[PDB]
């Protein structure tokens, strides 16, 4: 029974000055990092609350890592605490995911710090792509399921700010500064397409004010990302835009299952 039982771990974060809970299933030296959505809770990762992800990846030859917490964090290193909502520390989730957590998992379990997959949805879809863009040795594979693919452009900084405020009262200004700050472009998957191409990252991209207007913005940004990836010489992407696909856990799970063979072949093949 490889990797069982599912474990709940306490992993210290020096950068955040606290312990981060991590749900973990073993089964191989390489791992799928399953990142949570905008409303990430402090008890369980949304993948475990809403999907059979652990069971689906049981005996896949891959470990599964579900970090817990980080509501509205975008899994990034923030400039400062979100003072607005009383946050008493600075989110440093990029530091945690790229240094602190892999060091702990390597030392204690033998999970490789390199050759892994980052899989994100909603808020963390972009995160996964950005992690692969800047840390290609750690993440030769990244999936973005309904992610914000061009967060620095047009309506997106405003919409992201509003979403973060609605999800725990977090302040985008404290995260990446005003939309004019270099951090917005740094953390914009569209802008970092040349890195994804140069790194030959295997990317898996899914997607499904008035709703119609939002849908229009989303459709256009997604098409632009896909087109720009192709134009920039990208040749290692899967783009899934099925008409009946939705922005929900059941279809995010469908995509997680669909990509399993893909991840196995890239990471273990």
From Swiss-Prot:
A GO cellular component annotation in the UniProt record: extracellular region
Enzyme class: transferase
GO molecular function terms attached to this record: diacylglycerol O-acyltransferase activity; trehalose O-mycolyltransferase activity
Residue span of region Fibronectin-binding: 54-64
Top-rank lineage group of the source organism: Bacteria
EC number: 2.3.1.122, 2.3.1.20
Compartment(s) of residence: Secreted
Keywords of the record: Acyltransferase, Secreted, Signal, Transferase
Keyword Signal on entry: yes
Active site: 122 (nucleophile), 215, 247
Binding site for substrate: 38-39, 122, 150, 217-220, 224, 247-249
Catalytic activity: an acyl-CoA + a 1,2-diacyl-sn-glycerol = a triacyl-sn-glycerol + CoA; 2 alpha,alpha'-trehalose 6-mycolate = alpha,alpha'-trehalose 6,6'-bismycolate + alpha,alpha-trehalose
Record function comment: The antigen 85 proteins (FbpA, FbpB, FbpC) are responsible for the high affinity of mycobacteria to fibronectin, a large adhesive glycoprotein, which facilitates the attachment of M.tuberculosis to murine alveolar macrophages (AMs). They also help to maintain the integrity of the cell wall by catalyzing the transfer of mycolic acids to cell wall arabinogalactan and through the synthesis of alpha,alpha-trehalose dimycolate (TDM, cord factor).
Quaternary structure, from the entry: Homodimer.
Family listed: Belongs to the mycobacterial A85 antigen family.
Official protein name in the record: Diacylglycerol acyltransferase/mycolyltransferase Ag85C
Species in which this protein is naturally found: Mycobacterium tuberculosis (strain CDC 1551 / Oshkosh)
Taxon lineage: Bacteria, Bacillati, Actinomycetota, Actinomycetes, Mycobacteriales
Gene: fbpC
Location of this fragment in the whole protein: 49 to 328 of 340
